[PDB]
């Protein structure tokens, strides 16, 4: 099934009458407007392109403005595509609200993880540190050996090394839906989701089920 | 006088269409390689591409003898330490039929820049339809 | 081993 584009508002909790505190992530899901419908005949695959939010008119380029004008919708902050499931039909200009998740139970949330910059092997790959004392010379958090000897004579591809950590697309699966509030355009899911406050999120019905 | 040399700017190339239905893989490939290189022409020059354009149709119906449908294995390494991958002839035909013919012909063409240029003149199709009617290919029973 | 018995008590060449 199709999903919706939302925004990470932050985390809080929901106290139940039983006395259980549920950690929840608040996702603001405003109306998603269909901008284009892909069909097998013209594009070779079935999908819908949606936009959400608003954008300053002075920031919309003429190429982008023309695209929105054909659909007849106001400009949003971006464009996202969702693959259709054959039994699903949508029209250009249609608005989809958070009511889609009324009876979904479990969702998969995709977002961009927080960026950690250049990370070492201890942090990036959970490498063990060498001895802090007992003679160690300038080698407390260094990687150690990176290969064997002459037989290979090289380092193998995929060797875990220091480098950029974070700032990448991540999907968390099978998150329980706690509350769907159409009036407030809100979706509450149990647990933490990737990204910082204010980041764009992609919510879809759970695939594993 | 000096021996004649073909000029890459004045070479005349023709278009042909071949049907691969029920033809032995290897024996078909040798003929394709000959004509792609241009060994069938009196103007053959080893350093000039003097061959012809060949369209191969029905690549999925090519034949092999013996038990090679289930026993011929295609190997490739991805570059990562383990990375040794294998695929049988039947599996290749199911996933990407064109590859089978392309792989065979490539192994029979000269290696190097000129050989790669010769390979570009081969157009392999899994089905019975091609879109090169404008080039007016001539039927070649080979 | 090749180079044993000590060299520079460990630093090799020394002098410097």
């Amino acid at each position: 099934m199709i999903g919706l584009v939302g925004k990470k508002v932050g985390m809080t909790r929901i106290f139940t009458e039983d006395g259980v505190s549920i950690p929840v992530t608040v996702i603001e899901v405003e109306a998603n407007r269909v901008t284009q419908v892909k069909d097998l005949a013209n594009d070779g695959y079935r999908a819908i392109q949606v936009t959400t939010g608003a954008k300053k008119a002075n920031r919309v380029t003429k190429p982008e403005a023309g695209h929105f004008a054909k659909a007849g919708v106001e400009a949003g902050r971006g464009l996202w595509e969702f693959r259709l499931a054959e039994g699903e039909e949508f029209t250009v200009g249609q608005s989809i609200s958070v009511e889609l998740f009324a009876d979904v139970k479990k969702v998969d949330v995709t977002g961009t993880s927080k960026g950690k910059g250049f990370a070492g092997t201890v942090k990036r790959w959970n490498f063990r540190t060498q001895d802090a004392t007992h003679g160690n010379s300038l080698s407390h958090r260094v990687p150690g050996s990176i290969g064997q000897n002459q037989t290979p004579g090289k380092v193998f591809k995929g060797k875990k090394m220091a480098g950029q950590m974070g700032n990448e697309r991540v999907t968390v699966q099978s998150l329980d839906v706690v509350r769907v509030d159409a009036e407030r355009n809100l979706l509450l899911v149990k647990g933490a989701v990737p990204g910082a406050t204010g980041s764009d999120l992609i919510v879809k019905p759970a695939v594993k089920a | 006088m000096k021996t004649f040399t073909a000029k890459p700017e004045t070479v005349k190339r023709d278009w042909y269409v071949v049907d691969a239905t029920g033809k032995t893989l290897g024996r078909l490939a040798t003929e394709l390689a000959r004509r792609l290189r241009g060994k069938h022409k009196a103007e053959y020059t080893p350093h000039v591409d003097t061959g012809d354009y060949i369209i191969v149709l029905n690549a999925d119906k090519v034949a092999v003898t013996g038990n090679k449908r289930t026993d011929k294995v295609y190997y490739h390494h991805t570059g990562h330490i383990g990375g040794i991958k294998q695929a049988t002839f039947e599996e290749m035909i199911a996933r990407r039929p064109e590859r089978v013919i392309e792989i065979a012909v490539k192994g029979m063409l000269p290696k190097g820049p000129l050989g790669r240029a010769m390979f570009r003149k081969l157009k392999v199709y899994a089905g019975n339809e091609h879109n090169h009617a404008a080039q007016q290919p001539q039927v070649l029973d080979i | 081993x090749v180079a044993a018995x000590x060299y520079x008590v460990x630093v090799x060449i020394x002098x410097x």
């Binding site: - | 006088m1 021996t3 004649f4 060994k39 069938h40 022409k41 009196a42 103007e43 053959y44 080893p46 | -």
Partner: protein, 59 residues
Amino acid sequence: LWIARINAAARQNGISYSKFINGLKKASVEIDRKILADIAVFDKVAFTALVEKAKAALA
């Protein structure tokens, strides 16, 4: 190079290089391969005549 060109031109006339050379020998034709390759490219009519002579000798 000359041999390869003669082979191609002969097969266009319906005979292999090996048989073509044998036929010329049996017909006492002493043209060498350098000249044969030149004729094969520049004078295709004359090359056809050579092939016919070779075929007649082999018969």
